[model samples]
Target chain A: APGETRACGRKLISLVMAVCGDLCNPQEGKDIATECCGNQCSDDYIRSACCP
Target chain B: PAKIKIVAPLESALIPGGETYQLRCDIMSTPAATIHWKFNGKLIQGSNELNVEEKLLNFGKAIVDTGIVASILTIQCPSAENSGTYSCVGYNGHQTIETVAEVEIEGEASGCRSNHKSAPEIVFWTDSRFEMTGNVATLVCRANQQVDWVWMSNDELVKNNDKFTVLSNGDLVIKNIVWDDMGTYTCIARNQFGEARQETFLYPTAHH
Candidate 1:
């Protein structure tokens, strides 16, 4: 099960909190984190370890 | 029937050795979904190098059932042997969904002298904070190798000030931190091989 304190999760949540708090609701922080954490990366191109 | 979808898309890149890579499959399903991963079209028994995580999340504070059962696969220190096609599948007794991705990992760093240093990587960076509102804080950012460092705040280059002091060791210090003092800070590391970045966010429980 996913914990709130994974290093990647913490790093991701920190970035999301930076953006979502300004564009959307801060309460949606965890939700955003969960969404981004599912990095639907494909073999098509390059991508970050954890990001949109 | 179970409603499932991969909300985000994936992209492959030329990853360096001793670096990290990750694959995530976001499945939105009620009653949660059973998830699994595959490598080269076959199920993986296991690898100490891979960190697999499963999450059942409550979106909008929804109680049971209305949640997403997601899976995250992190490839720690990927090497040439770890390169290949990867897949994530979700099933719910009645239906199953799958997504595929391919990755190419560079070989180990043992090339000829003609080859320079590999790209620098951010070893780690934990967001540093202060006990109270108005105090000193240091946002940590370190790299795996010796490299030049630069700090950015919300995409802008961070300028040194009475309260801001970025150390050569890669620690960005903030004195008399207040509410506005908190936000996103990015540390960019560069060398002849190339450049890489790591960032952190400061969410303060204090005031302005």
Candidate 2:
């Protein structure tokens, strides 16, 4: 995946946490992030994408 | 074999309304393929008046030497009607390929609504961030209505300094972030009626 693509996925992870209520529960948002981000990225990138 | 991919804007987009947006895709095939844009499974042609323009690149202009066609969909004044799935379909004689993604368009917000709301408020914002040192860090401050922004770091008003950039829509970006950059940042959103401020903290941590 392109670097910008990974950045998008990571930003989406943060978006999920921000608009988590817009989409799902807070605890369940990370699962959605993994689902969306894990497809083209490594587990390492996915794991650290949403630390804060 | 022929394949089509929506490289950019693959992740769902949350575009602010009224702004023009460009969504692009790459169609790769063994040979050059004829491409078409599809909106929500429907073909985008004369029937669709999205105020949209389509662009395609030649072999040399494309990211690849050949067999990879570049296409873009530019939508003007994006609104609720524009929110949906956008797909790029490619045909290479015996093969047909498609790639799609969802997009969310926000309603164009005005300074005042028909119904009177109290004061300006931050609807959503960047709560906090933990970015690695030497990386860029961004903080957003979104308000209910159109507003201006003033960013502050530890009570000191932030400017468009060499290291910091304050965007038009109230986003503060720090390039090549350093350890000292870790602090409580304030995003003050001001509008015709009033102003609202929120604090977002930045932290530097190693990714384990």
Candidate 3:
């Protein structure tokens, strides 16, 4: 049941939206989040979270 | 019996603590075939651990037991907090197939002031829409938001922001918010819904 969102490193954003766990680092955090959330994450959404 | 048979793929990378995670698996056969699941790399033997009727496999929480990662694994509320590899295998006799998802734990900050570990889950931005300033200026933390605060000056946590006060709801109030009290004020909210941290870099263009 994993879907992928396009743009804004969509998957990166989605993964974070799906699972929030032992987040050791923000980089690792974003990588896993997008994997889970998939396409639900949009470009506009990820830019804000990722840029700053 | 007909030559048609099923061969399910291997399921993998299961977490020990997740609400709903599908085991990545597939099947191979002609005319299609209904697939059944077996655990531990062998057909499950009268093991009540599986609910075959519903196709729903449930695994309760377990401590950070390293050995659990290999072989036919189980999962639970898996988060960055839980890390390991999982395999999803399907079978119907056609051929043995499987998929693997690597699980890794990402550590999250626990909400605590002065420790920089607290990342709250709920967030409210400090904007003019609220009609408040430092004199009356304050950022209130509420609505299931439990983020710890650390005042910053020039990108660094400062000891004094005009002797501002923290209200009952974690609002930062300055006696008279002047031009200096404008900058990037960050608020981090963290809970089960994944840590939600927001930073509002404010640059006031005018004054009242």
Candidate 4:
């Protein structure tokens, strides 16, 4: 539910990676960030976007 | 699964007369939806002016002569008699939607008049002067015709602190005057509606 079509999470990471001049494995980057956190990474973690 | 939308400032509770407002009617679907306007929840029957995007509706200055709100019709120069609610309704094959707004007509006020019928040229002002004799100095305020409405002191602007100032007599007095006395005094009466002014010098008498 959090990964709605309009919500740009991975596209934002890819864009950020392209910015760091790190045009390497984006899936690997997502894996590392997820390991550092958890499966909460791909789901609830990615959903934390705006601040109240 | 298509829907019509009315993109207007949903937070505005009331609109004053003689003001301009924007109304937007749009539909998101496979095909575009046609829109129309209704006055006070009633359809105008055959009006075709709502097919466009955001439309600018202007209610020109109206005389304060009615008790009901002015209704925005498919015409211009709405009168106080035209006061009421306005609804913009949108319709597509899938759904229909409506947005409603109310307009409040208010009376315009002339500058405050002073009770001193002798001088009609005076406007309203506040007194900043103090006399040496332990008596509050009197400020003669006037709302003169043809003058911008406002109160001034030593070329500075003064406002009518409704708590201590009266418009009818056109004078504000600071009772129990002290040695801190003396300076020029003037009254300015102004509203977006009109303007007026009056001026007088404040000083100690020749002997006292």
Best by DockQ: 2
Real contacts retained, model 2: 0.00
- What is the C-alpha lDDT profile of model 3 across B93-145, one tens digit per residue? 34444454565534432431332233343322332111113323334333234
Predicted structure 1: clash tally: 6
For candidate 4 chain B, the 10 contiguous residues with the lowest summed lDDT are B62-71
* lDDT of prediction 2: 0.55
Q: How do all the candidates rank in terms of DockQ, highest first?
A: 2, 3, 1, 4
Which candidate would rank higher by DockQ, 2 or 4?
A: 2
Model 1, residue A25: distance off in Å is 17
- lDDT winner: 2
- How accurate locally is residue B41 in candidate 3, as Cα lDDT from 0 to 100? 44
TM-score of chain B of each: 0.45, 0.45, 0.32, 0.32
User: For candidate 4, what is the DockQ-based docking class?
Assistant: incorrect
How close to the true structure is residue A49 of candidate 2, measured as C-alpha lDDT? 42
> Which regions of candidate 4 deviate over 4 angstroms?
A1-52, B9-13, B19-22, B45-75, B108-208
Cα lDDT tens digits, model 2, B1-208, are: 3333332334577998877687665443432345567889888721121101111212122111112334556665677888999876665455676777888888873342333444566644444444555555566565656789999886789989768999886668776666567556888988778888876655433323
For candidate 2, give the lDDT of residue B69.
36
Worst 10 residues of 2 chain B by lDDT: B46-55
**Candidate 3: Cα lDDT at B36:** 31
lDDT preference between candidates 1 and 2, better one = 2
Candidate 2: pairs in clash? none
Order the candidates by lDDT, highest first — what do you get?
A: 2, 1, 4, 3
Which stretches of model 2 miss by more than 4 angstroms?
A: A1-52, B1-117
Clashes of each: 6, 0, 68, 30
| Model 4 lDDT at residue A38 | 23
Model 1 chain B poorest ten-residue lDDT run: B48-57
